[PDB]
Structure formats: structure tokens, C-alpha cells
Write a protein that binds this ligand. Structure first.
Ligand code: DFP
Ligand code: DFP
Ligand code: DFP
Ligand code: DFP
Lengths: 217, 217, 217, 217
């Protein structure tokens, strides 16, 4: 019943100019992989809102790149119904809705294999180039990433298939009201942002994302 | 328990440049006042979300001006809790939140006394100069309005005091989930709006709003 | 200077219902691979209009799938200038223009390795499911193909990279006037088609193409 | 060498339902006739492509009707050669081709005698009932028009004979490449038109065109 959605994007870009604290480097990422424990995916750090699971994190010459799976029907409905949409097809309407509402990732860290805590989908992340892609196929989710080492692609596909076998069939169900409140919060807390689409456009460029994306920026 | 909030603003400006359909003129407004029936105030036209009542609508030389009352504790909690706010005192926080989240009014019309149907608080209205002010005192809510005919002030104060006497003590209770779902909707349907704060700044100027407003534009 | 464009799509679907003559089967395709000689890519069978080269043809359980490269700047200009376009970005404008003008492939056959003669880009092909995809990356061109054996993907990527090494740097230049006349011909000869977009939509479905494609059907 | 082709049709219908701007009325047309200066005929408003001349424009009770002459051998060759035609006799092939490729007229206007600027042959015009007829005889070109005031016929024949005497022998020669580039453009800019033949069928009915026309709609 749930539309399995794949998210892909950089958790961080290595020499991007992230402030002192936020910055991530090759050796620290090297030491965090593979993660000791699975990285759950939640909405706007509200840890009650688990909606998926990070399948693979690969250290790309540009930064730690990841691929996740979101199998949550409540998240679908809550979004589908909120959209008193004027302006398609079907799950594409869903792709269009999640991409533009939740265009960024945000990695939380607690060096060793337990450094990476979890990833949160959000409107605007704190590190650069953190704009993600959503699609119903892993290959389709990673394709808009043109500045990606060939090895990263081949490795993220391999790990992601195995990883899927485990949580095969798992669906998350955080609670429609929990979901509803969490997304209102994502809006209310980002209302004071002067034109967020500039940042989106800018960070989409830094990530090397290009193509016929649903992202309207 | 509810913090009575006063909304004030122009429902429309007379010679502003509103498209054919939306345009309002002095004669039509003349004929519509006083309203046959009280004007309820709701959030984003979702009639289920009645949160207040329009006390006075005076035909100012510039356009139909209004003053309304919002007495809803659910709206307060729904907003207060969504704000995982970083960044003043108390109900001022409340003022700050609603002002920037729902900065515009929108008058629905069904000429005679039954023309004006209701007013909806919203992010961006379709008529110019429709930026409102919120405050815990009627006098405070109308003060930022500098291009206001002296008669309009004395008239809007007089009717408001009376009008309040009737719905004195009334508190609206649409239901927190209805509120929660309506506000997310306000957020989702306006996500593709490029910048928005420009329009808010422009239309604030048009209305002649000036002062130490919570409106961050 | 030329934008290398990748085309991908089925040259034919195995049990699709193609008329007696046009039909292709597994064993006949098996016997034609690898092609004795490279398969050039031309516009609407006008053999003077060579604009690219077929990189790989892989026998997929569904039909012979191929991946080609178009490196032609004249084709770019002729299209870019014809489009007195109302309605983006850049080479995407080019992607949008070539996809919707030339949405199909047409394989010409002269069984043995010399069966496959060449492929022609055209508006509407004669065999079913022959709707192609164009993109600036091979991976991005094949991603909209969801009903594709995993082996096909891994094989078409391997062959295509090697093949590219040979014609690396090759650009085609058929002649802008030749190009101009050939494309007018594509239009004039398909004018009598009652709604071609129905077929496009239909044959896009038969191919298992899905996603945020430039193809406006 | 050129095959003189006669075009006939309504430049506009009086009470058809043309949007605000495009709408034409009897008085304005009255004032515009006769045209101050001859009306050249071109392909798709590209003023470089003058291919004929409007002989008569008579104000019929239904709308401004016209009869024009097209004497251009390049247009003939450009069309004849583009058609890698499968599928009657000769100049009839020519009739068949132009009729279905450029089935509509479009009157550009700059009220006084200088209102009408020129008419452009095109695929789909913006005003209703603008479907034209082509033939090698004026009488043949106006015959399909059944809802035509008897006066209009006798008037349009009379002025046409005279008008011809002046531009008697004139043959236009825009240049085959100009022609070739203009026609591709006609094709590229109308590629996103869903169906088109419906509109052609509808507007043929509106004009009151009936008969054994080459127009395949
Ligand atoms: P993330 O990018 O934050 C990590 C640095 C913890 O963004 C949050 C604010 C949603
Ligand atoms: P209001 O300004 O609309 C009235 C014209 C009915 O704005 C709506 C779209 C929230
Ligand atoms: P192709 O699909 O034709 C082969 C069968 C030779 O289409 C042509 C008519 C463009
Ligand atoms: P015509 O009908 O346009 C006039 C109104 C100028 O059609 C053009 C768009 C070819």
C-alpha cells in the first residue's frame, strides 16, 4: 500500500565552507563507516517521526553520500490531503509534494562507527549542498547526481539492495497527527526565512544536481 | 484563558489596481454596510475554522476598513507548540507568531447588506493592501495605520465596544486537529510562492502601515 | 561545443502484437548481436542525416534495448532557432525540444550479425513501445526505464563506455540545410496523423517508461 | 511555372465568441475597407515570407471575407519535396499538401483604412472560423462556402478580377531556405498542440465550409 520512496543526496560536502562546528572531513567520515547502528530517517529531528531507514552511506571524494528508503503511508496521506492542489499523475504528485516541501537532509552526529546518529528530512539544512532527491527507484534517485564518483554509484547500489532485504516489508507509522503536527512545525519554524528557494537553488548547484527534477528550483 | 487578539486592516483599497473581478468601490461598500449578518473570521476560508468575529467595518475614504476579535485558545496552543522557536515575552510571542504566519485578510463576497460573507486570515490575499495588524488592544491594533481618516478611528472604536458586548466572553473552539490540518494546508499551498515577504512589504506600504510592528517585513 | 546526448529505448518489444513483417523475436535478435558493423543514428531514415552512433544493443527479456550517442551541434542550432519558444535552463531546452519532436526510434533491418542496418529517430515509429529517452548522461537516459532486467542495465553501461572510447570526440555534421529539410519532412509527412500524442502516451506505457520525463505525454 | 493558388475564407466571424481583444465587428470592418494599402500574404507572420497578395476583402453579413492569390514556385518545391508522400494527380497534390499544412488565416491589425496590416497562413489561427480553402480557380476556392451572402460572391469575384490585372504575372520568391526555415518553425511551435484536427473540424463548421474539400477534417 505504501509507495517505497528513495532519497539520495550528500549528507555533507567536504571543502564547502561549513562553519567550524558543522564541517566534516574525509578521515572522520572514514572512521564512521559503516555505521555501528542503522540510521533511521525522521522528519525535522522530531525523533517520534521515524518514516524510513538509511540504506547506504558511501564516502565519495566530494562528501558522505547516502541512499534511504521511506515506506510510510500516513506521510503520503497527510501531504496528499493538505495539498488542496491546483497544480499530473499519481505517486508523482507525491514525489512533487515531498521534494518541494522537504528538499534537505540534516545529519545528526553524537571518532568511531557510532558518530552518525540519524538523518532528518527538513526544509533547509545547516550544512551546504544538502539538497536531496526522491524517486520510486534507487537508480532514478541517484541519476540527477552528475558529480558522483563511479565507485560511489556502484557501491551505493550494492549495499542498498542487501540492506533492503533486511527491512524488506517494513513500513513506518509514526501517527498521522504526529506527522501533521511535525510538518506544521517545519512550516512555522521556517516562516521567517527570506526567500528559501534561493538557498535551495544555490545548494542544488553545489551538489551537482541537474536534470528534470521535481524540485522546482 | 484565551488571549483576545484584535485584528485591523483594509479589506480592500479603492483605487489600487485590483484586477477586474476583485475590485471594490465606495458605492458597493456603502450599500453593504452594516453587514446584514455578523462576519465570522476563519483561517484560510476553511469555514470549519471559525476563530473570531468582525466587530466593525467602516467605509474609509481609502477602502473598507475592519476591526475583528480572535478568542481561540486552541489556535494559540497549535501555534505556540509548532514553534520550536529559537527566537520575546509571552502573548507577544503569540502576537509575533500569528502576525508573520497569517499576515493577510481576504474578504469573501456572495448590491445589498448581504454582500460581505466573511473574512479569512491567510498568508497572502488576492487584493492589494490587505495586510493586517494584530494586538491585545483595539487601540494598539489600529495605531500603526497612519493613512486613516480620523472619522474611521472614532467610528471603528465606537461600534467595536458595542459589538464586543454581544459576543462578550465568546471563545471559539474549532478543534485543534482542524486547526492543525488547516494551518499545514496554508503552508503547503503557498510553498511555491517565490519570496512572499516582498509582497508583504509592498502591501504593508500600500496600507500605510508604519510603526514598531511584529510583522518582520 | 556539442552537447553529447544519450538516447535509450527499445528497438522492439517481443510479444507486443507487431504486424507479421515488423515483429522481432529473441532468437533472431540473439543471432544479430553484436552487430557486424556499427549502427549509425540518423534522422527520419534520410541516410545523409547521420547525427550519432548506437553504442550498445542488449537483448533484454522484453526486447532489444539500445543506447546511442548524438554529438551534433547543427541539429542543436536548427532546433533551437526553429523554436520561437514561449515555453527553462539550457541544454534542457535542447532535451525538451528533441524529445517531443523526435520521440521514437525505428530500426531498419537488411539471420546473422548484419541484420541490424541502422536506427532512425522519428516522430512515430512502426513497431510498438518504441518511445525513446534523451539525456546528457547514460544513467539518466536509462533510469526512466523501470521494466528493465538488471543485467541489461549493467551490460549496456559496460559496452557503452568502451564503445564511447572509440568514437570519443567524434561529432557529426550532416549539413544545417540537410537537417532543416529533413525535419520539415518529419512534420509534413506526419501532418495527417490524428492526435499523435495518444500513440506517444500509449507506447510510452508499453515501454515501461515512467518518471519526470521531458516527454510531454 | 508557378501554379496560381486562390485562398478564400473568413478573416473573422462577427458574433462567434472571440475573446475581448481579437473580436471584430461590422462597423470597424466597414471603416477598414477598402484597405489603404494592398494586403500581402505571408507564411506564419514571418514578414520575409511574402508568397501572395489579398485581392478582395468584402464585409459579409457574417464577417470580413477575403480572396487571395499565391504565386510562389519555391513554396511548391519546398512542400512537394518535404512530402516523402505515400498518399492524387499533380497540382492537386500541391493543393492537398498546403491545405492540410496551413489550414488557417490570421489577420494582423495595426478605426480607419490602415487597420488591416496583412494576413498570415498558419496551422491554427487565434480567431474562430478562420479555416481557408485553396484552389486553382477563384470560383472553386469560394464554392465550399455555403453560408455566403450572394452579394459577397458577386463582389469578391468583381474586385478579384481587377486586382489580379495589377499584380498580373507577379510571382513571389522569398527564398527556399527562408521558406524551409519558416515552415519547420510552424511545425515546431505547434508540436504541443493536443489534437489540432478537432479545432480544424470545429472551425470548418463555424465557417460553413462544406464540400469535397482536400481538407482532411
Ligand atoms: P541539520 O542540518 O542539523 C544538524 C547539523 C544537526 O538541520 C536541522 C536544523 C533541521
Ligand atoms: P482572498 O483575498 O480571496 C477573496 C477574493 C475570496 O484570498 C484567498 C485566496 C485566501
Ligand atoms: P521505423 O519504425 O521503420 C522500420 C520498420 C524500417 O519507422 C519509419 C517509418 C520512420
Ligand atoms: P493570428 O490569428 O493572429 C492575429 C490575431 C495577429 O494567428 C497567429 C498566432 C499565427
Amino acid at each position: 500500500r505504501a509507495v517505497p520512496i528513495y532519497v539520495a543526496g550528500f549528507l555533507a560536502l567536504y571543502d564547502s565552507g561549513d562553519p567550524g562546528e558543522l564541517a566534516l572531513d574525509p578521515d572522520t567520515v572514514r572512521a564512521a563507516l559503516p555505521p555501528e547502528n542503522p540510521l533511521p530517517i525522521n522528519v525535522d529531528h522530531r525523533a517520534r517521526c521515524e518514516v524510513g531507514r538509511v540504506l547506504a552511506v558511501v564516502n565519495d571524494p566530494r562528501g558522505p553520500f547516502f541512499v534511504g528508503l521511506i515506506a510510510c503511508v500516513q506521510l503520503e496521506r497527510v501531504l496528499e490531503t493538505a495539498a488542496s492542489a491546483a497544480i499530473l499523475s499519481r505517486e508523482e504528485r507525491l514525489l512533487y509534494l515531498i521534494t518541494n516541501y522537504l528538499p534537505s537532509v540534516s545529519l545528526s552526529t553524537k571518532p568511531d562507527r557510532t558518530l552518525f546518529a540519524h538523518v532528518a528530512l527538513c526544509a533547509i539544512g545547516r550544512r551546504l549542498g544538502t539538497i536531496v532527491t526522491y524517486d520510486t527507484s534507487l537508480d532514478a534517485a541517484i541519476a540527477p547526481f552528475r558529480h558522483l564518483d563511479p565507485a560511489t554509484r556502484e557501491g551505493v547500489r550494492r549495499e542498498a539492495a542487501e540492506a533492503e532485504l533486511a527491512l524488506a516489508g517494513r513500513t513506518w507509522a509514526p501517527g498521522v497527527e504526529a506527522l501533521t503536527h511535525t510538518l506544521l512545525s517545519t512550516a512555522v519554524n521556517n516562516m521567517m526565512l527570506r526567500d528559501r528557494w534561493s538557498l535551495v537553488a544555490e545548494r542544488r548547484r553545489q551538489a551537482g544536481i541537474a536534470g528534470h527534477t521535481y524540485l522546482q528550483a
